[model samples]
Target: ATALTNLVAEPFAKLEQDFGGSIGVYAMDTGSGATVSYRAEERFPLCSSFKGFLAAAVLARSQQQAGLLDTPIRYGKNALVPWSPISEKYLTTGMTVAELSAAAVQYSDNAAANLLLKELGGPAGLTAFMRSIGDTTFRLDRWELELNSAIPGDARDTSSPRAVTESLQKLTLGSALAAPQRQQFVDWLKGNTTGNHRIRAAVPADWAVGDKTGTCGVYGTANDYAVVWPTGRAPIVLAVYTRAPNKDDKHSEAVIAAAARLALEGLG
Candidate 1:
């Protein structure tokens, strides 16, 4: 067997292979309880994917007030933004809170997120729910369109790899939200379809990876955080982040994918 220190060194060495940029990653196996990390405390913009946290926060609030998820929130013209496939698909009709969450999670729809944020009582509400988990630097300062357009390190939503992993842990195993409510939040993750280039690039078809992908082009950052359930085993959690200048989104996503492949393989 590989020695503990030497064993841990093996994966980090592989994760950084040929990736010339800022990067952070965290992965843990639920069955064996082994873990791997790099730059776990650092922060990076979460871009559009912090929708997962928004979803969890809504579900938690729903636990406090019945039918909150089904509450109606109109998709006003204000919600639309560039690159929103889901908004283009809907919005002539008003959307329930659950529908808005699906749009944000499944399509990374900017409009849906802003609408959901409004329902969550804006940045203040989302952060309040986030605090129920722990104190950390992860931030949700504004709506999606505004976040992407802002200064790279400024009001844009930011997170450490450990913060993301720990939140997922709470959403899954702890009492951050009621069991069934959190399960709905997790269900939305499995429904995600827009993210294909980053962590999804490294996932196997037979296995299940419930994840959220965040990207901010202005900052050259890409991120994917997941709870992976390997065939017939307990779930494992993983988060991968990368940022670089003058590189296309695909190029940056590949860096995150490289790290994810190594981490998933280590769990095997």
Candidate 2:
């Protein structure tokens, strides 16, 4: 573990020089319960990554009523907004709650998320759920309250890096749901399809990364959080949030990818 820590620290230190921005990173190995965290508590815009929380809420609700799993949900005109690839593809028709969950995570589908938010009793319900989990540092206020509100300044939503990591940890460990339900939710996350350069670049090709990525109007203010279940090694939860001078998502991806690798190496 000490060797891995030394290996990753240098690269993380160099990211500041290379990217010229502010970043917060946090990581934890669940198996060994070893952790490596840096700027893990810093707040940043959550963007679509907020869907993960919404996903949890949905999963929890589904568990309370198993019928929700098979409940049919139609994507209304309002639910088929323009921000999501799913809506862009004109998939605003018949879809189950489970399918919405898949679309929300796998494609980061905003339309699906909004619909789920509504189904979960809107933002107020999400907030109540978060509180139930003892997560006071962050709230789902924006998700439900500002559902129809125009994108705020910079088009970025709000969240803390630490909050994101903590949420991921809780969800991964089934702290947010029943034991069986937790496994189900984790499996759902494992099938997420929004995989890009951030978490994907940091680990071995075959490593299972259940994660979500967030990018607002530009790339510079990107964020990523994931529960990495590596083969033969400890499972880890990681979060990386960055705000750059320019909106270059590629740069953000590089920086985050580097940071993730460093964090994992540090956990060894």
Candidate 3:
């Protein structure tokens, strides 16, 4: 761990030299539980990465009632945001919870995400679910328009590297659902195509990576969190969160990829 820490120190220091905003990383070897952190306690906006919790909370809600996914839902008057491909291509006044979850995570569809937020009784409702699962570092304040349009630097949906990864560990570990149900959540993330250019940037083709990536062009924050396969053989959970000084997602992507490569080397 010391050597890995030393290895990242130079590169992270170099990143800090020019990166004028907060960046945090928290990685753990799932098998051994060994860990690494850099600015793990500092909170940063999670952007769409918060969608995972929303999915889990809804799944938990679904568990109490069968076929909740088939329950019909519709776009609110202002549900369709400018960036959602799903809402753009399909004038979907009607979609199921199942479909919405897939769109929210797989495509980072804003309308899908907002619908899920609404399904779970809005942002405060999801925050209560977060607390039910023992997570305390987040409130997750708003839906799509209100969330993205507010003050650029305010902490609307904020989380630290430590809190996010911890929540993820608990989530992927079946805190909200049973083991099989939680594995379904993992499988949902496996289908996430939006992050193919980010964490999957340099990973091996055969080694499956199930993850989520968050990018807020308005706030300049990018986050990626994933669990590398191989549950028993010491596979790792790598969580990278960053707030770049400006709207340079390209630069932020590079930093995350570099950090991921470093984590891969440490894993082996």
- Largest lDDT belongs to which candidate? 1
Q: How do all models score by TM-score?
A: 0.89, 0.84, 0.88
Candidate 1 global TM-score: 0.89
What C-alpha RMSD separates each model from the true structure?
2.7, 3.7, 2.7
Model 3 C-alpha lDDT per residue in residues 157-265, reported as the tens digit of each score: 8877777778788878645677766877888888899887666775776777888888776545788888776533655677887775555433368777767666655
**Model 2 segments more than 4 A misplaced:** 1-13, 87-92, 143-156, 245-251
Arranged by TM-score, best first: 1, 3, 2
What clash pairs does model 1 have? none
Q: What does candidate 2's lDDT look like per residue over 1-268, in tens digits?
A: 2436454455666786678766778787778776776656656667677788887888888787978967877655666665577644555456788777777877888877888888878766776777778777665555522432323243324656767777778877756688876886788778877666888788787888888877654546677888887788778888887765655434367778888777777774
Off by over 4 Å in 1: 1-17, 149-156, 245-251
lDDT (Cα) of model 3: 0.74
Which pairs clash in the backbone of model 2? 1-268, 106-193, 123-144
lDDT of 2 at 32: 77
Error in Å for residue 54 of model 3: 0.9
